[PDB]
């Protein structure tokens, strides 16, 4: 089997991407944030504290003839950005772009933190990291991909995120028309539960490539590119007037600037992030100070190849017995 679904930016900045997901019978379609940095499929629901729902579409398990309470199961998650959610668990039928999994754990939120409530466009998350990170207790549950894998034509999914435009998540096949050149594959460590890999280096603008190993995670659920402070300083040093602002919480730059590109290495291959992808607009409405899309990972504890990086590539998440990651230009 295969599936193919369009993923759409939530706003004009590409702060996140939403993908429609069918849950239950008859289908209830929710727009979920596909997150290769976590492993829970959780949704706003009829059980969510009413004051914490503001415009989201909810899953109502009582209206699904295929929903079954997973007795005794609870979940609770906290994300790298400080947000969180928790609740109980149903199993139900879940379909993404024509690919159907029966008996998928659908984690129903009883509580969500403010940042989720405040984002009306995201109805929940669909985790695509390794199932070892799944938070369901006392019986850990499998991700949608893990459940689908054996049925797929090939045990892979691909992320093709757009810049200021829709893109695609495919399951079970590589669309060879979706990228240019060849796909370069690179080793993955699953020891922390992430799609963790090592970039071979970077360049700033038309500058020379610096060969250096940069361990990090491919994370569709993180907006920005978080890299070591040395690398980030080298980038922003090429932007007149850019500075790290402790009050804002990162590098800012004059909105009048033209940003240089940023290149990262995948083996001997190179992925070029155009400068415009690195502009996240005014820090507050009407400001002429703009927020940068490349930020320091210092104090996160890990480097994160988030959407800023991934959207410059066609990315293969290869879930073979020994997983790997592939990157192609597009």
Curated annotation (Swiss-Prot):
It catalyses: Hydrolysis of proteins with specificity similar to that of pepsin A, prefers hydrophobic residues at P1 and P1', but does not cleave 14-Ala-|-Leu-15 in the B chain of insulin or Z-Glu-Tyr. Clots milk. Its EC number is 3.4.23.22. The active site is at 35, 199. GO terms for molecular function: aspartic-type endopeptidase activity. Disulfide bonds join 255-290. It comes from the Eukaryota. It is an enzyme of class 3 (hydrolase). Keywords: Aspartyl protease, Disulfide bond, Hydrolase, Protease, Signal, Zymogen. GO terms for biological process: proteolysis. Residues 17-328 form the Peptidase A1 domain. Belongs to the peptidase A1 family. This is Endothiapepsin. It comes from Cryphonectria parasitica. The chain holds residues 90 to 419 of 419 of the full protein.
């Amino acid at each position: 089997s295969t599936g193919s679904a369009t993923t759409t930016p939530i706003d004009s900045l590409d702060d996140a991407y939403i993908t429609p997901v069918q849950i239950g019978t008859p289908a209830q379609t929710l727009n979920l944030d596909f997150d290769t940095g976590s492993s829970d499929l959780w949704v706003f629901s009829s059980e969510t504290t009413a004051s914490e729902v503001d415009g989201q579409t909810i899953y109502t398990p009582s209206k699904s003839t295929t929903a079954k309470l997973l007795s005794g199961a609870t979940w609770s998650i906290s994300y790298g950005d400080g947000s969180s959610s928790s609740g109980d668990v149903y199993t139900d039928t879940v379909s993404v772009g024509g690919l159907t999994v029966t008996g998928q754990a659908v984690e129903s939120a009883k509580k969500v933190s403010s940042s989720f409530t405040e984002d009306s466009t995201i109805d929940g998350l669909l985790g695509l990291a390794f199932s070892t990170l799944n938070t369901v207790s006392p019986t850990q549950q499998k991700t949608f991909f893990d459940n689908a894998k054996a049925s797929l034509d090939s045990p892979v999914f691909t992320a093709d995120l757009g810049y200021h435009a829709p893109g695609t998540y495919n399951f079970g096949f590589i669309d060879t028309t979706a990228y240019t050149g060849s796909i370069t594959y690179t080793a993955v460590s699953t020891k922390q539960g992430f799609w963790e890999w090592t970039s071979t280096g970077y360049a700033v603008g038309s500058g020379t490539f610096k060969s250096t190993s940069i361990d990090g995670i491919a994370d569709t659920g993180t907006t920005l590119l978080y890299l070591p402070a040395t690398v980030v300083s080298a980038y922003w040093a090429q932007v007149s007037g850019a500075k790290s602002s402790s009050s804002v919480g990162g590098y800012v730059f004059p909105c009048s600037a033209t940003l240089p590109s940023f290149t990262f290495g995948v083996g001997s291959a190179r992925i070029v992030i155009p400068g415009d992808y690195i502009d996240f607009g005014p820090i507050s409405t009407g400001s002429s100070s703009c927020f940068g899309g490349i930020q320091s990972s210092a104090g996160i504890g890990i480097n994160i190849f988030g959407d800023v990086a991934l959207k410059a590539a066609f990315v293969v998440f290869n879930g073979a017995t020994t997983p790997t990651l592939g990157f192609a230009s597009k």
